[PDB]
């Protein structure tokens, strides 16, 4: 049994005890996913604040901060934005497969 505990690190110094406002810290990520994830998280009707931020160009880090209104924590809203980004990549893959099979 071996998970990976460096890839995502919730920063408790800026995380509300309510859970509805947290600041995550990914390693080895940048504008690639952090702008794709910020887009899909902001489509949740319960999200009040979302933004990604790279602290310095040197280290490969990524901070995204979700604040919700209520009845959904930011950890609960981080993972809805990861499934809908997983579901969106399957739509694009299912359309780009048809059109290659349409030539």
């Amino acid at each position: 049994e071996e998970p990976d505990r460096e890839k995502i690190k919730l920063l408790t110094q800026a995380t509300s005890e309510d859970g509805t406002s947290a600041s995550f810290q990914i390693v080895e990520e940048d504008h690639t996913l952090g702008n794709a994830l910020r887009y899909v998280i902001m489509k949740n009707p319960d999200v009040e604040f979302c933004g990604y931020s790279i602290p310095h160009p040197s280290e490969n880090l990524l901070n995204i901060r979700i604040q919700t209104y209520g009845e959904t924590t930011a950890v609960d809203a981080l993972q809805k934005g990861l499934k809908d980004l997983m579901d969106l990549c399957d739509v694009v893959e299912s359309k780009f497969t048809e059109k290659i099979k349409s030539m």
Binding site: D4, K7, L10, L33, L85, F96, M103
Partner: protein, 304 residues
């Protein structure tokens, strides 16, 4: 209220052309922060096979050893990825390269004088005076004879001029070719130029019928503006053809009569290839890497 079923009902793909090296295709009604990520991955994250470690035995030619080892690394190999596996970084050298990670190439070229009639061209006058990229001889090491027999390792452009010699001089080397991503070094980049452009939008405002419509033809590429008469005056045939040169916005007859914007969710991707993979297939790798970039973040714990 945004939903992923709303995205599926209004997302189209219109493939313009699809060559063996370049593919051109449009994505419609997707966000700029998602279509940027596909360009982003095709350059960086999509892996490829490049020579990484170069072992010289004798290089007596004019080109330096660290330069010639760099030129071999920029040679694109026609190796399919998802045959090699990823080499490990923190295991020592005697255990690091296997018959499953590494492809071994080699090169043994000596130049000799040729007795020829006479100024004179060096392909007539010296034997092995030009080293090409096809002289990288694939050496199937380990069990790479029952699995690379259909597909032998050949450079994707076999006429890349690697070095030049004169008689007496020789090059004798052995390069290990390993898998890697383009974000580390640019030689692992599977695509020459993966890029998009945004669809131009030409909004004529007043009717610009007449001889003025003939000089509104000329302010665009020829397959953009069409004319019939004062009726069917000036309509946009194909805005995809237009490069945004803004030649119409420097005339005083048309500073008021047109507006030049973009269609903000209509992308026009142009994906070439380094030869190792077809460009429609390094796009599927790009869209699955982003999905696999997100499953690994979903199915992952959070401590402290």
């Amino acid at each position: 209220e945004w939903n992923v079923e709303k995205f599926k009902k209004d997302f189209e793909v219109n493939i313009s052309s699809l060559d063996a090296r370049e593919a051109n295709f449009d994505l419609i009604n997707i966000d700029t922060s998602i279509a940027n990520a596909f360009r982003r991955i095709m350059i960086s994250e999509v892996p490829s096979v490049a020579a990484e470690y170069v072992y010289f035995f004798n290089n007596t030619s004019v080109i330096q050893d660290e330069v010639l080892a760099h030129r071999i690394g920029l040679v694109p190999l026609k190796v399919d990825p998802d045959m090699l596996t990823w080499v490990d970084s923190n295991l020592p050298d005697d255990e690091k390269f296997t018959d499953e990670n590494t492809i071994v190439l080699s090169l043994n070229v000596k130049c000799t004088r040729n007795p020829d009639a006479p100024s004179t061209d060096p392909k007539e006058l010296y034997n092995n005076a030009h080293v090409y990229a096809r002289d990288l001889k694939f050496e199937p090491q380990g069990r790479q004879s029952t699995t690379f027999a259909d597909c032998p390792v050949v450079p994707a452009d076999p006429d890349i001029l690697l070095a030049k010699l004169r008689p007496g001089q020789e090059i004798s080397l052995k390069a290990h070719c390993i898998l890697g991503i383009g974000g580390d070094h640019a030689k692992f980049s599977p695509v020459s130029t993966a890029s998009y452009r945004l669809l131009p939008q030409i909004n004529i405002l007043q009717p610009i019928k007449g001889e003025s419509a003939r000089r509104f033809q000329k302010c665009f590429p020829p397959g953009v503006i069409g004319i019939d008469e004062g009726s069917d005056e000036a309509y946009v045939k194909d805005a995809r053809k237009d490069t945004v040169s803004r030649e119409v916005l420097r005339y005083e007859e048309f500073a008021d009569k047109v507006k030049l914007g973009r269609v903000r969710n209509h992308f026009i991707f142009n994906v070439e290839s380094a030869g190792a993979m077809t460009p429609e297939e390094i796009f599927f790798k790009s869209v699955r890497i982003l999905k696999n970039k997100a499953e690994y973040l979903k199915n992952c714990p959070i401590t402290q």
